[model samples]
Target: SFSGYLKLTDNVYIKNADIVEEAKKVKPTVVVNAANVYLKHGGGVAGALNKATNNAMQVESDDYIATNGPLKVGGSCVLSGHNLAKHCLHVVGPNVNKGEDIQLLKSAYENFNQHEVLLAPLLSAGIFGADPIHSLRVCVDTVRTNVYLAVFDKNLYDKLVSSFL
Candidate 1:
C-alpha cells in the first residue's frame, strides 16, 4: 500500500480551490462527482466546466449508469473526457447533510491507488453539508495512504489541517 502526503498539486484548500485552475495544471484525467445517482456538475465546482466540455461529465455519467449502473457511496465511474481529462473517477462522496460517517467516506477512496492523477474537489467538506474539520481530516488521511497515488492540488492550504489530525 502507498503512504505519504498527497501530491502538493493534488491536495487543495477548500477556500482557494478552483476546478478550472486545477485544470490548467492537470487535465484529461481528473474531474469531480457527488452523492445520489445524478451526474450533474451544477451542484459543485461552480459549473465552470459546463460550457467548455459541453456537459460531458454528466453525459458520461449517464452512460456509466447505463453500462454499470448507479454507484453507492464509495462507488466510482470513470468519465470520458474529450481531452478534458484522461480519466475522471466519479467517486460518490458521502452525504454531508448527515452526521460524519467516516466509515462511509472511506469507501469513496478505497481505490485511491488506481489513478495517477484525479480531478476532483475535497471528496468534499460541506457540499453535502457534512462535518467540517472531521470530514476534511478523514479525507486527507485516507488519501495519503494510497501507495500508488500521484496527482495535483487545486489549493495550497490543504496540508495545514493534516497535522491536527
Candidate 2:
C-alpha cells in the first residue's frame, strides 16, 4: 500500500513509489510522462512507463511526433493509456543545466491542468538535470489539478517530507 501522508496546497501529494504502480491504483487518473522534446521513451521514468504499457506509450509518442513534429520544451501531448491509467499526458519540461528556467517546467504542468487527477513524476529532475526539490516546488505551486507526485529516491522523499513539515 502507498503510505505518503503529505498532501499540500492545491491537492499535490508526495509518495515514494513508482508512478507506474501508483497509476494502477489511482483509477480514472491521467499519468504525466515527464518526457523529452522528441517524446522518445528512452530511459528514466518515461522508459519505465513505456515498459509498463508494453510500449504503447512509445508507439503513440512516435505517431504523435510523426504527425506534429518535435515538441518544444514545456510542450505536451495526450495519449490513450493501455494497461495503465485512463490517459497519459506527456510533457516536455526544462533542462535547468542547459539554462532553462523553472517557468518552462510550470508550463508543462499547466498543460495537464484540465485533467482532475494526475499521477506525475518529478519533471526535469532526472537526466534533464533540474534540481529535484526545486522542480518539486515548481510542480506544487503551478499545478491546480489533483496531482500525485511519484518520488522514487529515498533521499528526495526525506527532503520532501521535511518541506511539508
Candidate 3:
C-alpha cells in the first residue's frame, strides 16, 4: 500500500501530487524537468515554469548542448528567474517517437544530482512512452540526493502503488 509518502529507503521518497504544486512545497532552489534540447517549455512539465529572468536567455549555453536548438533529447538547460521555483533545470527527456533514449534521460538526472533538494517526475512516462516504474528505479539507484518523485496522474499513481511490495 502507498500513502502520501512512498519511502524508497533513506531521504528518497515517491510522493503522489501535482509536481507544479509539490515543487512549491519543497522550495527547491533547482527544479528539474524532462525537457528537450531546445529547452522548450511549451508543454508538459516544462510548460508550467513562468517568469524566467530576462538574463536567462543570455546564458543559453546553460543548456549544455551544441548551439543548435530544438531537439527531443541530449544536453540540458538550466535557467533562473523569479519564475516557478527560482530556477529551472531542463534536460532532454525521452523521445519515444525516436525510441526511448534512456541514456540521455540519465544524463539529465546525473548532471543535476548535486542539488541538495530536487523535484523530478518519471521521465518518458507521460507524453513520452516509456513506462515509468522501471525508469523510476533507475533514478533511485543513481542520483545521490534524497530526490522526490512527484506523481500527478492517476495512472502513474496507481502504477507506483501497485509496484510496491
Number of the top candidate by lDDT? Answer: 2
Clashing pairs in 2: none
**Tens-digit lDDT track for model 2 on 1-165?**
335636767588888887888877764458888888888888888899899989888888899889999988998888876778788888889977678776788888788688877788889987788878788788777888788888878788888778753
Write candidate 1's Cα lDDT for 1-39 as tens digits. Answer: 113434432443233345555554556355554434456
lDDT of 3 at 35: 72
The model with the greater TM-score, 1 or 3, is 3
Lowest summed lDDT across 10 adjacent residues in model 3 is found at 49-58
RMSD of 3: 4.6
Q: Is candidate 1 or candidate 2 better by lDDT?
A: 2
Ranking by TM-score: 2, 3, 1
Q: What TM-score, over all chains together, does every model reach? A: 0.67, 0.90, 0.76
Candidates 1 and 2 compared by TM-score, better number: 2
What local lDDT score does residue 165 receive in model 3, on the 0 to 100 scale? 44
